[PDB]
Design a protein around this motif. Structure first.
Motif, PDB file in Angstrom:
ATOM      1  N   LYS A   1       0.827  -1.227   0.000  1.00 61.31           N
ATOM      2  CA  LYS A   1       0.000   0.000   0.000  1.00 61.31           C
ATOM      3  C   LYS A   1       0.859   1.273   0.000  1.00 61.31           C
TER       4      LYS A   1
ATOM      5  N   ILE B   1       1.003   3.972  -2.993  1.00 59.63           N
ATOM      6  CA  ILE B   1       0.838   5.418  -2.737  1.00 59.63           C
ATOM      7  C   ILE B   1       2.087   6.204  -3.192  1.00 59.63           C
TER       8      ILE B   1
ATOM      9  N   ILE C   1       1.651   6.664  -6.939  1.00 60.99           N
ATOM     10  CA  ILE C   1       0.681   7.728  -7.214  1.00 60.99           C
ATOM     11  C   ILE C   1       1.356   9.104  -7.042  1.00 60.99           C
TER      12      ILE C   1
ATOM     13  N   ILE D   1       5.625  11.944   4.627  1.00 63.00           N
ATOM     14  CA  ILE D   1       5.309  10.804   5.495  1.00 63.00           C
ATOM     15  C   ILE D   1       5.975   9.547   4.922  1.00 63.00           C
TER      16      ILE D   1
ATOM     17  N   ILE E   1      -1.393   8.838   6.623  1.00 65.62           N
ATOM     18  CA  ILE E   1      -1.822   9.233   5.261  1.00 65.62           C
ATOM     19  C   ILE E   1      -3.334   9.267   5.207  1.00 65.62           C
TER      20      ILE E   1
ATOM     21  N   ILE F   1      -4.636  12.502   6.573  1.00 59.40           N
ATOM     22  CA  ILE F   1      -4.423  13.613   5.633  1.00 59.40           C
ATOM     23  C   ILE F   1      -5.526  13.590   4.593  1.00 59.40           C
ATOM     24  N   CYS F   2      -5.821  12.402   4.087  1.00 58.81           N
ATOM     25  CA  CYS F   2      -6.920  12.242   3.156  1.00 58.81           C
ATOM     26  C   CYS F   2      -8.263  12.650   3.765  1.00 58.81           C
TER      27      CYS F   2
ATOM     28  N   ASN G   1      -8.786  16.423   4.089  1.00 57.89           N
ATOM     29  CA  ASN G   1      -8.810  17.132   2.829  1.00 57.89           C
ATOM     30  C   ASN G   1      -9.932  16.608   1.957  1.00 57.89           C
TER      31      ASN G   1
ATOM     32  N   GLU H   1     -12.520  18.325  -0.988  1.00 58.46           N
ATOM     33  CA  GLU H   1     -11.755  19.132  -1.931  1.00 58.46           C
ATOM     34  C   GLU H   1     -11.849  18.537  -3.329  1.00 58.46           C
TER      35      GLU H   1
ATOM     36  N   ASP I   1     -10.163  16.225  -4.662  1.00 60.40           N
ATOM     37  CA  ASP I   1      -8.839  16.036  -5.225  1.00 60.40           C
ATOM     38  C   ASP I   1      -8.770  14.602  -5.755  1.00 60.40           C
TER      39      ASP I   1
ATOM     40  N   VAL J   1      -6.352  12.840  -6.952  1.00 61.92           N
ATOM     41  CA  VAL J   1      -5.189  12.081  -6.490  1.00 61.92           C
ATOM     42  C   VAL J   1      -5.430  11.493  -5.109  1.00 61.92           C
ATOM     43  N   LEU J   2      -6.076  12.251  -4.227  1.00 65.63           N
ATOM     44  CA  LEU J   2      -6.403  11.757  -2.908  1.00 65.63           C
ATOM     45  C   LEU J   2      -7.440  10.653  -2.986  1.00 65.63           C
TER      46      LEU J   2
ATOM     47  N   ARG K   1      -7.491   8.448  -5.395  1.00 60.50           N
ATOM     48  CA  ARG K   1      -6.633   7.284  -5.713  1.00 60.50           C
ATOM     49  C   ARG K   1      -6.000   6.700  -4.449  1.00 60.50           C
ATOM     50  N   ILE K   2      -5.490   7.575  -3.595  1.00 54.92           N
ATOM     51  CA  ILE K   2      -4.799   7.158  -2.393  1.00 54.92           C
ATOM     52  C   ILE K   2      -5.754   6.511  -1.394  1.00 54.92           C
TER      53      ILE K   2
ATOM     54  N   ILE L   1      -6.446   3.015  -2.470  1.00 53.51           N
ATOM     55  CA  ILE L   1      -5.366   2.092  -2.127  1.00 53.51           C
ATOM     56  C   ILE L   1      -5.483   1.704  -0.659  1.00 53.51           C
ATOM     57  N   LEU L   2      -5.673   2.712   0.181  1.00 52.86           N
ATOM     58  CA  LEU L   2      -5.702   2.498   1.629  1.00 52.86           C
ATOM     59  C   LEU L   2      -6.723   1.421   2.027  1.00 52.86           C
ATOM     60  N   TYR L   3      -7.906   1.460   1.425  1.00 57.89           N
ATOM     61  CA  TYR L   3      -9.000   0.543   1.777  1.00 57.89           C
ATOM     62  C   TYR L   3      -9.149  -0.691   0.894  1.00 57.89           C
TER      63      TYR L   3
END
Lengths: 67, 59
Positions: free
Chosen positions: A30, A34, A37, A55, B34, B37-38, B41, B44, B46, B48-49, B51-52, B55-57
């Motif tokens: 992960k 990231i 990305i 981070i 991370i 932060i997502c 925000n 917004e 965004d 790209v966020l 996308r992130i 990935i996280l979930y």
């Protein structure tokens, strides 16, 4: 029987190792996805991505195996 | 001596557990940083966020 007791302990710890390896590697994957990305969207001055890059830094591969 | 051999193996596997678990925890903590932060925000829009977050979930 110490040998029998230790063999059971070994079997249990081995499973634990296999599980932790998978967990570690999944979370690392992960972080790497990231990082990708972020790298793709590099040079677009998104301050939130800068936060995330910062981070990510300590999790870089080069600190685990030299690159 | 099987008991002695196995004892050394336990010692090595305990150290291996310790190392893997600490690494797992460190990577988890970074993902969680991370995540926050997502979350902060969100709204917004965004991409790209997004996308992130995805990935996280991911399972």
């Amino acid at each position: 029987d110490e040998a029998a007791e230790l063999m059971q302990q070994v079997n249990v710890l081995k499973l634990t190792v296999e599980d932790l390896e998978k967990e570690r590697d999944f979370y690392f994957g992960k972080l790497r996805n990231i990082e990708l990305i972020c790298q793709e969207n590099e040079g677009e001055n998104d301050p939130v991505l800068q936060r995330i890059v910062d981070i990510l830094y300590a999790t870089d591969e080069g600190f685990v195996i030299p690159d």
